[PDB]
């Protein structure tokens, strides 16, 4: 059976947007903008989007659209690099092992939102410690004795019952049920392919923007919202002289766009050959970054409201990550008129933000491994069930009582240096070994124009250089594993490094396997490993372009 195409281009576009835009855009980018010079932070961020993020996004979309393969089997163009695709698939599975747990947290909060008295508004619950204090009497974000912080930690995480990652306890049945619902939704969104995934993203990718619009219109009218917005966009150009600001912008671009993660390649593998993936790459990257910028306005409207309610400054309330959306935002919601409506819409928005990114991540695995194995391709429902059930079982660790520690370890070591290395290897294998000139010819075959010298330069030198810089800083600026005041044991750090290395060693391991499993002399084996599999009849003729300097000097 031939591979199906997207039922519509809107299906593909919304799948790409849904994967790209998630809770990161909302809970990481605004805080980075506020902490890294406000509107000045947009200069490194926009520059990196232009020079690395957009070029990589374009590269992966064009690669998927031309080769019509997943992350692993797209390396028929450079056989030695199939380990890179295997590493990307492994990283996607690893990331899903903990990302769906944050989705399950959003689902738990949404279920808890179906009340006129939100559980995070007052103390006096079973999960409340005697130190719980009415927040109207009170860094604020680090105060753990508020109804919202205590609700999160003790009635959602039950983290008070785990002393560390050495004793994580058993999975929590409420979070277990929420994870079951999340994985069932993922299965029935993924089991019948892109034909139904592309229609599910009509809701999961567009609902967040409606919710964000209503949140913005309400936030701008809140007392103190203007002060929060001013703090958000206060331009400090002297912050651009610090390497930390540029490192943060580069890391945010790389980990928000998701280029080279195996998802864009899989999505473009279902495109029509005529599709203009250049326009789609530009549009979707711009949408991701503009969504982050616009969501920062709502985030900091609420932050300014909270700072005005507690008579504190933005620095005291300003926070990021799960803490923001699960403590600070619920607390603000509990003080609003119609707090139930706001909680429901906010957590529906979090669910929509996370669900299509989980869809994209699991589609990466499913497409990549179905392209590699025909049994998996002809059994999509069974293989999707296998993937989702494995994700559920291995995410059961992150919904234990000490599941936040496992989640921290995974969020640190599953797609960090490992995914950065995998994407750098992809960029090298495409723009140097396969050839940026060959890639441009492939793009011309589909769109009738070759990419301009800008894109070829970015693919061969800038995006590889950006990725190398980000890997080097990720390794250099590694901080030992910690969660709040908890410091993980050394063996936890070793386990995290092993998780990081598990996918990264597949690249050299596959190169060694391919070299040893290919018959011939050393040069014949190298030629077969760098030559596209449909050109291996030329290796006998001793016509290998990678063995000439014109190939490597070809920009």
């Amino acid at each position, epitope marked *: *059976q*031939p*591979r*199906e*195409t*997207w*039922g*519509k*281009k809107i299906d593909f576009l919304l799948s790409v947007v849904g994967f790209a835009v998630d809770l990161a855009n909302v809970w990481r980018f605004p805080y980075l903008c506020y902490k890294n010079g406000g509107g000045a932070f947009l200069i490194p961020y926009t520059l990196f989007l232009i020079i690395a993020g957009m070029p990589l996004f374009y590269m992966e979309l064009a690669l998927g659209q031309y080769n*019509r393969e997943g992350a692993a089997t797209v390396w028929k163009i450079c056989p030695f690099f199939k380990g890179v695709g295997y590493a990307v698939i492994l990283i996607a599975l690893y990331v899903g092992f903990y990302y769906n747990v944050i989705i399950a947290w959003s689902l738990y909060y949404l279920f808890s939102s179906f009340t006129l008295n939100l559980p995070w508004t007052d103390c006096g619950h079973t999960w409340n410690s005697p130190n719980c204090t009415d927040p109207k009497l009170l860094k604020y974000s680090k105060y753990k004795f508020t109804p919202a912080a205590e609700f999160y930690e003790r009635g959602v995480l039950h983290l008070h019952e785990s002393s560390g990652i050495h004793d994580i306890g058993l999975p929590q049945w409420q979070l277990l049920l929420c994870l079951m619902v999340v994985v069932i939704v993922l299965y029935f969104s993924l089991w019948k392919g892109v034909k139904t995934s592309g229609k599910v993203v009509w809701i999961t990718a567009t609902l967040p923007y409606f919710v964000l619009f209503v949140l913005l219109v309400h936030g701008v009218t809140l007392p103190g919202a203007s002060n929060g917005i001013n703090a958000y966009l206060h331009i400090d150009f002297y912050r651009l002289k610090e390497a930390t600001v540029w490192i943060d912008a580069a890391t945010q671009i790389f980990f928000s766009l998701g280029a080279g993660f195996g998802v864009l390649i899989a999505f473009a593998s*279902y495109n*029509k*050959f*005529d599709n203009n993936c250049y326009r789609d790459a530009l549009l979707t990257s711009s949408i991701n970054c503009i969504t982050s910028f616009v969501s920062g306005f709502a985030i900091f409207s609420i932050l300014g409201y909270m700072a005005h309610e507690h008579k504190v400054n933005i620095e005291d309330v300003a926070t990021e990550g799960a803490g923001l959306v699960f403590i600070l935002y619920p607390e603000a919601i509990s003080t609003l008129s119609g707090s139930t409506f706001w909680a429901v819409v906010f957590f529906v928005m979090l669910l929509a933000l996370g669900l299509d990114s989980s869809m994209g991540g699991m589609e990466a695995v499913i497409t990549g491994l179905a392209d590699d194995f025909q049994v998996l391709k002809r059994h999509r429902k069974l293989f999707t069930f296998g993937v989702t059930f494995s994700t559920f079982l291995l995410a059961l660790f992150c919904i234990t009582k000490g599941g936040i520690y496992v989640l921290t370890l995974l969020d640190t070591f599953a797609a960090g240096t490992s995914i950065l290395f995998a994407v750098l290897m992809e960029a090298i294998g495409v723009s140097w070994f396969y050839g940026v000139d060959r890639f441009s010819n492939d793009i*011309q*075959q589909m*769109m*009738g124009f070759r990419p301009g010298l800008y894109w070829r330069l970015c693919w061969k030198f800038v995006s590889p250089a950006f990725l190398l810089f980000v890997v080097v800083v990720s390794i250099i600026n590694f901080k030992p594993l910690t969660y709040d005041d908890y410091i993980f044991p050394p063996w936890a750090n070793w386990v995290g490094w092993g998780i990081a290395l598990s996918s990264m060693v597949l690249v050299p391991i596959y190169v060694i396997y391919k070299f040893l499993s290919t018959q011939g002399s050393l040069w014949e084996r190298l030629a077969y490993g760098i030559t596209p599999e449909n*050109e291996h009849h*030329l290796v006998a003729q001793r016509d290998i372009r990678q063995f000439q300097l014109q190939h490597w000097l070809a920009i």
Partner: nanobody, 116 residues
């Protein structure tokens, strides 16, 4: 899906030759129809795409004209000012039939074109 190529033969340098691609099993008017040649590796020649856009390889641009007849479900390749370097077996290819379709990537058996 089936693709039958016809129109190839022996032509003189600078001569004209029209290849035909009779398609069955799909509508060519919404399909990405590609022409390739193999004298060497298979080389993309021209394409008439889902929305009717005609694109050509640099080697043949200005000399070849790809066109389709919706009524006959046939794609044509009008090869003008042919040169000996154009001697090859020309393959008609359907990449897909649009969006709500399948990636057929079906190839014809090829039509031999010889110049001079």
């Amino acid at each position: 899906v089936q693709l039958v190529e016809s129109g190839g033969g022996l032509v003189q340098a600078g001569g004209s030759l029209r290849l035909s691609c009779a398609a069955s099993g799909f509508p060519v008017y919404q399909a990405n129809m590609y022409w390739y040649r193999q004298a060497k590796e298979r080389e993309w020649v021209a394409a008439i795409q889902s929305e009717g856009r005609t694109i050509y390889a640099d080697s043949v641009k200005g000399r070849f004209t790809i066109s389709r007849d919706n009524s006959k479900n046939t794609v044509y390749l009008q090869m003008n000012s042919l040169k000996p370097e154009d001697t090859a077996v020309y393959y008609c290819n359907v990449k897909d039939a649009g969006w709500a379709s399948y990636q057929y990537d079906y190839w014809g058996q090829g039509t031999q074109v010889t110049v001079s």
